[model samples]
Target: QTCSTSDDADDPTPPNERDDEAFASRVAAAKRELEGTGTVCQINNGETDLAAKFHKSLPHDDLGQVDADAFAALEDCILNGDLSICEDVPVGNSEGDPVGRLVNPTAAFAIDISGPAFSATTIPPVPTLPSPELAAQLAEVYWMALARDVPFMQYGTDDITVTAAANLAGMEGFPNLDAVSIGSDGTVDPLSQLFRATFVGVETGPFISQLLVNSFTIDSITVEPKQETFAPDVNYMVDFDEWLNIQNGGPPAGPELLDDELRFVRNARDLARVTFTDNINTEAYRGALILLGLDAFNRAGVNGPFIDIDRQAGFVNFGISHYFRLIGAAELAQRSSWYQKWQVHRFARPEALGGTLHLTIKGELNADFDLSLLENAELLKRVAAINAAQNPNNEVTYLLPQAIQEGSPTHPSYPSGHATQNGAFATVLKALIGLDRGGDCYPDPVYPDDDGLKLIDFRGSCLTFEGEINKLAVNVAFGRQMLGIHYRFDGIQGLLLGETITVRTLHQELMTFAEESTFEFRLFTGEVIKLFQDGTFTIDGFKCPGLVYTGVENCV
Candidate 1:
């Protein structure tokens, strides 16, 4: 409350009088914004043709980035973000069409985007396609795809969910779950108690129901109904013919997963589409904080110039509109995500990996194929059973069945777009919601009932703002996993990736705001920090030390 503003037209004093004063501060913040860049993944120069890596569409770069000419072409294209470098080069291209079809490959290089541009080159190459780490991630995705039809309420003891938990437990290194908190009685919980983060912040609930359900809403709509929709029975884009066409950028052909929510997800295949197909900047997530209103902001201890004024801030210089605009602005780094995927990593989609798994099992492509989870007899038996049930007509194979027909958007798959944007939106929300507070969530936490129609009071550990907001972000990111496009690592990196984008974007945003203020916020990694109008930053009150040559900038 140290800053004040006036409406007097003739006031002689200007709060921030000079442009360079702000410009100099901005340059300083921008310097810190790019702590990590230019790091590259270990290029597999010797490894030959394998089904694990991404060589979809283009037949050239089989096993991915191994050929010198192909790799050279890609490096040149990435350095310049130009199509001219890509043409006639051994770089990737769509099959049959002869012309390339990359999903906005050079979006990272665009100045039109915001969020203090940084190269996502620091993101590591995906785990080796044939390794145990990749196997573990695939197993989890397979389990989730199988359980997508299972209601949120039934996850507690659902036969499918428990089976998934067991398989994941058996994986060589399951990253998502903890040995403890599977359940109070040493079994399973809502999959994230199986899938949810085990670490709980001070005063935040440690239960899955609390994570899934919330207690408050700013709108008249109390108890929002989760559309009971799931596509379990009919999987798309799994057939050999179907996948070849899809990889070639051909149109998707099949009956669409229905959106009937009559009994909840019996046919509610389109659930989470709003979160999925949202505007690139996440207007849905923005619409929410707006609905929560400034009351929640004050409870979270936000200090603004207009708190005492007759007209509280909204749509003005330093009010609701600024923050809302920032939420979208921060996420523009998705273009950065695109560059990481199409330009650098160019990793295979989950469905692509599944096809490789199919090829390996059927004795077509061989390169230590059975040396990983593909060799798991139990997993094979289960996956075979599901595919058998679905494909009584076609030969049984292990390709990951997709929720949608086209399988995934025509693009490289790594550092998933959904996760990047979701992560960006989530970080912005955390800052907007304010960092230090009671951490208590809205009263009477609610979760979608078994039918997905009415919500029920979810009695569990009390929810907190940070807990719910963070959970909400992951829910959207992982919702894509439920569909079978992005992998676990893709989503994981996205959270961290978009997070960096937002933090720097926030720091950059500091230069523009007119108010003299100190903002408190938390990173997804659980560190607390403060930023000032003076362009100084502190981690847990100590000034961040590594202002130079730091990667990922862990101020703590």
Candidate 2:
């Protein structure tokens, strides 16, 4: 008997006894379960959409009379028997196959196409009694459908959807069968087999535990002080005036001891081609240097002469010889020389170092030191060669006769010797005395007592010793600039280079002292500190800033 579509229609068999009704009920139940789950029924197959398409493709004469053949056709379309919705819509070709084939149960299961008709046991098993050509066609169709639809189905646990069908099969009174497996020969039930094949060899465990095994152990630790400190010395604390008296003769017996030291400090022209009042001369630096010398004599007492005559003399000689050679070579203008014509032009001019025109011409000039003398003949020759090699040919000249009445040294104007010398002297003195801000006490014996013949004394003056000493070094360097013989960078580079040399020399000298001996001195703060030949020295119970080496390697 055929099924009727009318609401009043009666059935000979009960709904439970009817195969068609039962199939319809199962389909409805499956649809309800798969709703909003991205299953095929809910996907492109909208509620009335699939049915409408089916009716249009294969229409019926009367809607009331549902033919048995029509029901069979509908069922076949829903299952894999025929394609109504998915036909004409081409599935892409797979490798080695030109024309594409229809999607098989294997492909449908891989993409998890929804519906009870396509369930695990419903589709034909793999390697059934089909011809070899048919088997290949089915294989091609399965792959094409997989390539087309698997990507859409791969969301969330759709890959694990097999478990749902397996459980449903178990509940339906079928034996709780093992999940389907793909045979080695590729002959098996395609739907169930493909589902099991998804996670064929995947293993599961806590992988993080393996990586974290030895990652939680401590390495090492260190302890250090918050503030940096240096060793104190007692020798720097002796009374300034009393020591001076002992070193030379007293006021009544002989001349002041530091008179020679004062002359040395004031002798700016004797050391360089520039004088104190020259065009590029730095006044502040010159005055600062004078003051630095005065303070050193007042402070050092007996040690003043050694600082002025011996240590300073040596530093000056070393600085002058090297600086003179360096400038001379630069001005010589050999083929490989780094200095150019424009550079030489700037170096010889006072304006390059920020001097005015008036200062360059009318400012205090140097002594009658001539560069044309036999002692400087080779330098003159080299300078002439350089000038002749230029484009203007001899127009670019050194600071010889043009800038000064008497010819100056025939050399490059960079790296003033005075500046280098001053840098070395200041660095050494700074190291010995330590730095001071101001407001330190010292004897000033300029004022006289009310009684005409008595000695006068003044005390406690504010003096920025560290600042003054630095200024003095700078002043000496710029003093050369004022004479129109050196550029600002000349003084700057010289000072830095000289300091580096002095530090290395001092480090070497300190290492020569006996390891067992202890050298004691006082800082500008009047704090006494001791230095041992061994590199290990403490400052107020704190370690020094840098590392200490025992024997060969020492602290700077």
Candidate 3:
């Protein structure tokens, strides 16, 4: 049997009864189930539309810029798969610079700049949708291009279409499958072997514990062709613009059949570069450096410094604050497991400590030793949620430059704040606990010193915790390295230095009378209690009332 050509035709081949239907279903189901998951489908759809649009919108003037022979060869390459005229084609080098294979980051930018490469137009009075097989082929082509980090070659379009058509062609008619596999040296029917194979792996042998399940369904599809005059309106334009955007660099609008995790990563990298360059500077090398970060500065040499000074200075505050918010959220979210909400607030704004303690515990430094693993589980969730919440107005808020001068300035890229925040929190933890501490630990100080002078002295005068703070800074700097955003040494020492300064200041406040009065530390959970008991002075190093008191004790 074959697909019916009649007006109200059903898929002539039924599921189990027809070989053609079975073949089509197998391929379709496999393709849909295997790669179907995330953003890959969206990016592929956009690339397709943009590719089509780019081809359609080509200016003949641009073609004139190419050598005559080269242009002819390029046209041949587009129309046919022949590469014999490779030498005749001009090497697209208009800037007198040699062409090179683009790195993934740079390739992403190239793809974005190439614009929409796939598009479809529908004539009126018909639902002009590409066949499922054809759509799948185009999707696969885009995904393959991204995976290779190369431009989609025009010559392959027809081949891809043909391939898809062939797959569908095989499904036009049915075939019979009369044989099946049987156990070694068995005379049993293949169907018997199939039944054995299906039930052998079952663990809970078909018992009365579970009953048979059954279901029924009725479905229908209605199609109509009608002629109507269509007019352009604001809504149409808006919708089309959005659709085009989706068809360009936007998210996937297709079904899950095309989603691929690796492809989405490629898509993300591309989108990141486009967003960076488009939002960065427009002036020559300076713009390039601003988009690529400091590594570009080194590659371009001394003159690079002069060009990027504006970018560097602008990024300082920009990067710092961005990290502050990100880290603050990370810390706040992790407070339940590793620390407390107060710890986050304390780190963010020490001044808040005094106020918060007064409200929560009636002016006493408190501790929570019942930490759980809630933070780690919630970290990824928070990242996604916060990104969505903040992304709508991302440019206005997160990307706003600290200072802007002259023509539209480039976006800053330097000491990443995300690295900073993560480093700070991680470092602070390392400081309090040994750097090699295997798991999250919340320690309860035994003796409490209320003079506020002891804590300040420990922070300002002692070197113990200072080293841990530095460790965290170093960790963050290394974190940036892990992300490939910073050089090994670029952020390392600087982060340590910053942590030293920041942590010291925080410790000073934590020890101050004004700060200590905000929260009371009890024997175990509250602020440390100071007592001159048994003439021993349980709070060690309490010579000065306003200094940090470090004493050892067990909390019950």
Candidate 4:
């Protein structure tokens, strides 16, 4: 303490490690360039001219100073009053999705400068589909919906049950009953009793009358002695006492009668020559409708990011291909590494993803209920034998054609791979290219020299770059559903997951730079934005210092 010398050699000061001084100097220079200029707020020539002005404002020697130039360029381009930057970046280009080259010159410059860093780490991999066991579980869900609710949900009860009696009366083998008369005091005739037994549950008066007429018509048929001989089977009906015992909680005795009951129902339908429209047929019809809509999209020659196109040919010739390539290079780039990491551990194949409906249903439910009973070859032979037993003249032959069923993918279907690809790539592209501005003429090779074919004249065609990109992503995601493998929620959840990953990556990138930084750019909605680092931002307003983000919690 006594040796307090003027030459204090031991107390050397530490060097300043912060880049704030340098950053602040650059920001000051940028503000000087932007101040007192009415042209800064001009709407002419989009944001390109404004970016050029900002570029000229910075000292020529500081041009290659990456961070300084990048921030200056963005601030000028985005803060300028002009909403659009690239008004002439043509629509429907060979690149699939259209990107405005000069939309926000500063953002474009920043993205170019930062491209290498962004590409350093790709998106994490996730399953596109469910595992096999999960697929089986999903099948059970489908079966429950198909069996209990689909008909009522789709067609309503009026079609299924209310009209059943009238529909049954129109069948060929239904009896006629005009000869029997009603009692004078409104007592029911013996023929009425027979009609009531035939259609026990048909409560309508018109249906009851039709049933009686059909019963009498059936009874009027004459038989030759040797040509047709009546024979009754003693064991045809179930024993009354045994049925009562079953009702009283007794164990099943004699034959396991479920199959017999089904056979009886089948024979009844065959006798009546009745054909009820089935859910399977309706599913096929719905698929056909989807195909029609897909055809319309293809005819327009609008290509999406993940859409298959012939790069060798012109853009107009691009259309949907039969061979579905769900996962592409872009998708794989995002997913491959993450999937590889969890390939053997977290994700396993589900058994129900790819198989015949018969096997899938039976395996999951542990029951032998034959819903597609018409597809059974043995059923035809059994029907033929039953027809011969009942009446030779009432033989029924079903014309069964081989249905061309659509197949599912070999991959899992949890978060749809197609949807994930769409979301991830779309988000990345949206970040790279400024979101707004799309309305310029591009050649329509699909209908060459035809005005109708051209997606030109923005006055009538209200297509924006944001909408086009989003539509492309949506098309790819929903395209999977049309292909018949993915569930609705699969694509929905996939898009959310993909967007989350991309946003997180973007936020991380933002954090890598200085804290007092400011970034300005235009959104897909053509709104100008100025983002300040000190927990403040704006979208086309001054006092409205809008929500902000900090990369951790408290993103507003």
Candidate 5:
């Protein structure tokens, strides 16, 4: 049988060289199409810079050649497009300019979540150009908006323009057809502009890409003012208990009366200041008015009667000593080949199940640490006793509303400070050890002791250090409640807000690096010289052995 028989032939048809060339040409054309040829306006004049200076509350430092309207239009555009939805206004400029201006309304139009690095490219759905007038206005507003908000974006994500653009694009329904608008009525509604601008700017870019790809669009609108709910009845028993305490020799003052008096005073002062202060100071006070309105009656109460007690001394001492012992154990554990494992484990959060396993690659090490020893049961009991002494309900009355709800104080309901201290110490342990890599740290584990007896496994390994710490923080807040001392919102909201602040600051630092020098990195004990180019760094490949060339961003 012929090896090249037609029935057995692998090549059924002749390869076409011309067809291959045609395919390559089509690929090139596609690439070109993807490379948009849009032009962005660049600022070169003084008038534009002057307008920006005005926003900074400084004299116009730049020469008077900049476009004031252009600058204002840009600021208005970014704030409005990203944080708000424009309504009841002609979106276009007076001269049929493509950009819009800023105004205020009861409702917010835009919100800049990403902070300062915000840019126009974050505008979403590739804004279908309605007309030349709309396009021109958009261009003008886009440039000015960049100048205004980019600084704020830098406060959070340092990549300035790029990062800001990315954050803005992450929001929903950004950059509408009526990107900027005005109402038919002579009266201007500031709220619509504020909400629309902020919404558009914050919700543009990759967020839009994903949304559009998934075939989504804004279809309806609803408006509802924020509600401040109160549950006075829940804390009534606690408050009454405190009242009984006053009858039985405790202080006569209560939180509700104090808060009422303070509110009256503050309101009167605000009114008086507005009537007497100069126009400039009055304008400054306007922001304070907004803040008061925003907070309304949700302000927290103060505990003034029992201000002399040294509440934190014992817990502080316990925490320091506990942390010291844990650190010593951590140091010893690091000596094993499993040190890296422990280091990673200490970073675990209760929610990080995968991280726990990854950190505890090795078998559990020696089990000596007892987590229960860290618990301050006596402290909680003592706090409960104090509440009982203060009032029959075992609660302290405050002059303000409860942390989450509004009402008077009842039994000794402040959160357990001892639990909070215990939790803080737990966080310290998590930072030192990895999660789930220890010996008998949980409920119970069987292990041979010096006496060869399987005793109650009270001490567990410091495996989920990070997770333990998070739990510590949460539990401490919860402990306050369990101890009948603190509110739930105090622990939950405090931790969340603290984490958000930390992350935002960390991101800001990581993004803005001005280092522009060469450095040496060791590759497997061998040295290689690295050079920074533009925004990236490249290393010399020859000196670094055992490398295979992958691509330009990589080395062989």
Candidate 6:
């Protein structure tokens, strides 16, 4: 029996005839529908007001928001209701018009997920704009920007980090930040530690992703590649139109590649910066996973499933093909992220919000910014000083100093692509070999040498495979955070999105397998999951009831 419907079976002509006249025609018609006919619902893009929307490339008033004419053009582009006569609307990388990535909103029409890609059920409503919560989140980001150069080893000792940790602890936002420390000693309070990511593993301080840098097996020789990034505090996208052009995918005038430093990570910013830059050039965590995977594979003490002496398959289902398929899973997870980011949430990136805050602070725009941000004398004072250091000429700016020359990619900011897909990637790896079904995980993980070049072992530690995977996912996700591109929720919620995709994938994709392998996945939330070969699944012990697109933005 047919499982799903595409066209119709009842009114279909003979197969060969249908194929002959229609394969090309069907493709042609799909393109035609791209022009506004395919949209199912005009989902609320976070808020209804034109000023509140993300219209990056359009002409704007002095306040730096997308004006009405540009917004009308943008909505037309969004709905595929285009016009040849909207001459005022800028496109195609004009001199000052920063173009945004335009393909994702259109991708919402996709129906691959049983739910459409734009299904409101995929994610929670974006945090209401200009909220105190939002303000506090950005304030944390500002602090992170200031502390980018402080070494991971010196979080408790560094003055900037000490201030940051205390500032975050005292802040009203980041409501769910755990009180547990992620240092070598878990007994210490969180405030004693630096800004820790959401999923702290068995051991702490930079995790394996950042600590060991990364090593690869090339022709049977292990090698670590040093990354090239800008010098610390060498930030970008503070110039508004320059930021816009990069968002538009237009070339920044000269030297976006400010590759002055080729070294291992000395601080969190470089750690996050390397991961951030890697994500754009390549699927970063995949490389990190591969390196970590190699480490896990070689360490026989952990004895994960792939390391079994009696494995029947080498690279068939559980080995090579799984890695290949895992890559595809990440892509699907990314597509799911696209729906939430572009079609439903349309939440602005921290960069966009920074511009808004800047203009508002300058009294250029009458907007909804909260007093939590406006009244933060320390934050305003620190950022202004940081701005003066960066731009001695202008000396006055409240914009978030981005981690890179280009700000965030030209897309909506909500769930990070890295978080969502890395979530999927790690989830699949867990399903494949998180642990040995019921075996021990990797024990006694290593941190990096203070010199930032070698892996140093830590005694009396118990880092698990599951926790390390979660830790790795968080490392990459929050690296974007430290890079000053995404808000914390973008990573936090995105991990959940990616996790759901992989868990569902295991439920659906594994059913076709003739083998009797059962998949177990441990979620970041500590809820255990198992998928049976016979097209059934369970959470803990019972079938899953349901879940969401839930939770608020947390910053600490």
Kindly give the number of clashing pairs for every candidate: 10, 13, 34, 23, 122, 3
Rank ordering of all candidates by lDDT, starting from the highest:
6, 1, 2, 4, 5, 3
Tens-digit per-residue lDDT, 1-556, candidate 5 = 4332244335543244445755775554333323321232222112221211212111121221124454344345324534343232222223321112222211222223221111111111111122232222222222222222122112233332343233223222223223222233322122122111111111111111110011111223321211122111122212433222221222323322112111110111111111222231222122222212222101121011111234422111222332244322222211111111111111111111111111222222221112221122322232234334445445532211121111112111111223222322332232222112211122221222222122223232331213223332332333233222232322332333232222222222222323222222211111232322122333444432212111222244
RMSD value for candidate 5: 32.2
Across residues 1-556, which tens digit of lDDT does each residue of candidate 6 receive? 3433344566445544666655665454333324312433534434665544566555555556666766676656555523333333455355543334454556555666321133433655555666656776777778878887776776767777776665655555545332223334332232324555545362343444432355655346765656675566666766666665564456554544444646666576766766665642144334434534555433233322434456455354556556555656455767678767765677777877788788788888666877767777777888888787777476578888887765676677877888887777767666666444423445444555655566666555455666666676777777888888787778877887887666655655554455556677666766567676554456666664332111112100
| lDDT per residue as tens, model 4, 1-556 | 3233223444332123134555665555334323411231211112221111212112122111113444354344444424352232222113221111222222212222211222122222222222232232233222211111112112213232222223223222222221112234433322122112211111112111111011111134522111111111211112223222221223334331121211111111111111111121221122222222333223233333213344332122222221121112133323522232122112211112221222223343122223323133333353234333433354332211100011122233444556655555544434432322222111111111111112112222333333344433443444344323344444444554454444433433443443223334333223444444333445565434212221111222
In the range 1-556, model 1's lDDT, one tens digit per residue, is 3333443446554544544466776565555555533343433223334344454444333322234555456556656777787554453333434223545555677753335454533565677765677787777677766776666656657887777776666666564332123445454455355454442332234322233333234455444324434334787766676666665445666655654653322111333443445556543344354335425454333234444455445343345565567666666768778767765667778887787677778877654643548777767877777777777585676878777776776566777788788677767666665665425465556655555566566565656666666665666666677678877778777777787767666766665676655557777656676767666678767787543212235565
**Local accuracy by lDDT, each model:** 0.58, 0.29, 0.22, 0.28, 0.24, 0.60
Cα distance off (Å), candidate 1, residue 418 = 1.1
Give all TM-scores, in the order shown: 0.80, 0.25, 0.18, 0.29, 0.19, 0.79
TM-score of 3: 0.18
lDDT of 2 at 114: 28
The candidate maximizing TM-score is 1
- Candidate 1 matches the true fold with a TM-score of 0.80
* Candidate 1 vs candidate 3, TM-score winner: 1
Instruction: Give the C-alpha miss distance for residue 154 in model 1, angstroms.
Output: 1.2
Residue 199, model 2: Cα distance from true site in angstroms: 77
Q: After superposition, how far is residue 309 of candidate 1 from its true place, in Å?
A: 9.8
Error of 1 at 475 (Å): 0.6
Highest lDDT model number: 6
In model 1, residue pairs whose N, Cα or C atoms come closer than 3 Å (at least 3 residues apart or on different chains), thus clashing, are: 191-194, 191-195, 192-195, 192-196, 228-264, 228-265, 229-265, 229-268, 230-268, 439-464
Q: Residues 497-529, candidate 3, lDDT per residue (tens digit)?
A: 223223322232223222111111111111233
* Candidate 1 error regions (>4 Å): 1-52, 59-79, 84-100, 111-114, 175-192, 198-231, 262-276, 281-294, 298-318, 369-372, 392-394, 548-553
lDDT of 2: 0.29
For candidate 2, write residues 50-95 as lDDT tens digits: 2112121122222211234543553343345334533432221223
